Ligand binder design. Structure first.
Ligand code: 3S2
Ligand code: CL
Length: 361
């Protein structure tokens, strides 16, 4: 009954959403009562007929930011930076710029004062161009006042964390962060030998899409991983105490909230909600206006532990893929939904909510 019921529940949540959104391939991984469960649907590639499995690599887009936050948590952990450091403390090129007056915390939580969703098209993946972009940028409003969701914001936070550790961001992730977390199917740059696992992405008229190079791509949206590895990361988040202390502390640093916007409390990478909450509210928290419009923040008097009866989550996309991760610390419950189409966030949340609701029931 239990195995049959869980399959029944996940199939029921997933299958209509896949059909309705014309999703070629979708992987689910659920952590429940200390055990992983995988459900794989459809095709990693429509053209070669490769099936989705729990080891298929998907682009997770902005979910990468939770890994970036973990690296930053490590640098914090290790007293190499503080959240109240000025950005320009960690990059001489920024001294004399507006980043003299913006904190690492502002950058991590999108309150630096109007850094946009993405780098402009004119900024290529080039150290000098990135440097020059930040040097010339001016806040639209006072740092610390408004949240505007931004790749250049948290991207810079990740880059500066790497600088504080004295190594390239990409090298730190490959050589330190991924091994510490036990992740052998998680990549910024997929090895040639593992490319057979890399799903095709699909956009309009099913054109094939895989993510290309962009400025601060590793920090903002660089990770390709499997449902099995992403669930391993969720399990590390559910039980940081199971990791060696330096990494336990790094993960804990991503479970601290600094302010609220509506129903959402903003942490490093993770965004949190009270749990239970209605599906419509959780969808609103992950809606297009949240990503695209500035919102005045409600600052907390002290950082808040994002634990107990809460749902922590992150959406992420690339042109060809759509990812969603959600976990409930107080229930030892986590889930990962990875697809090779960029389909609406509301639909991702709908699948997850149906699974979580069914598990409670
Ligand atoms: C991350 O996935 C961000 C946005 N995150 S979300 O929470 O709003 O879903 C969605 C699109 N994002 C992203 O990184 N896109 C990748 C394309 C990079 C293009 N920059 C030139
Ligand atoms: Cl960007």
């Amino acid at each position: 009954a239990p195995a049959d019921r869980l399959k029944a529940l996940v199939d029921a949540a997933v299958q209509p959403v896949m059909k309705a959104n014309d999703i070629p391939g979708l992987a689910v991984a659920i952590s429940l009562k200390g055990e992983p469960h995988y459900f794989s649907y459809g095709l990693a590639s429509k053209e070669d007929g490769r099936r989705v499995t729990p080891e298929t690599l998907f682009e997770i887009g902005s979910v990468s930011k939770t890994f970036t936050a973990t690296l930053a948590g490590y640098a914090l952990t290790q007293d190499k930076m503080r959240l109240d450091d000025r950005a320009s403390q960690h990059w001489p090129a920024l001294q004399g710029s507006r980043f003299d007056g913006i904190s690492l915390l502002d950058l991590a939580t999108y309150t630096a004062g109007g850094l946009p969703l993405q780098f402009p098209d004119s900024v290529q993946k080039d150290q000098a161009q990135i440097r020059d972009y930040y040097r010339q940028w001016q806040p639209t409003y006072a740092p610390g006042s408004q949240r505007l969701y931004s790749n250049p914001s948290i991207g810079l936070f990740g880059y500066l964390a790497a600088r504080s550790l004295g190594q390239p961001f990409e090298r730190l992730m490959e050589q330190q962060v991924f091994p510490a977390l036990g992740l052998e199917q998680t990549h910024l740059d997929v090895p040639e030998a593992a490319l057979a696992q890399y799903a095709q992405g699909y956009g309009k008229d099913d054109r094939p899409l895989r993510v290309g190079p962009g400025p601060l791509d590793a920090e903002g949206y660089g990770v390709k991983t499997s449902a099995a590895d992403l669930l391993r990361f969720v399990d590390a988040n559910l039980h940081p105490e199971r990791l060696d202390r330096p990494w336990a502390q790094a993960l804990d640093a991503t479970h601290r909230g600094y302010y609220k916007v509506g129903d959402m409390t903003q942490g490093l990478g993770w965004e949190a909600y009270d749990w239970p909450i209605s599906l419509k509210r959780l969808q609103a928290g992950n809606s297009t206006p949240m990503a695209l419009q500035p919102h005045r923040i409600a600052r907390l008097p002290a950082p808040q532990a994002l634990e107990g009866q809460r749902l922590l989550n992150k959406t992420g996309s690339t042109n060809g893929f759509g990812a969603y991760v959600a976990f409930v610390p107080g229930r030892d419950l986590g889930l990962v939904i990875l697809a090779n189409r960029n389909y609406p966030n509301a639909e991702r949340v709908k699948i997850a909510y149906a699974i979580l609701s069914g598990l409670e029931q």
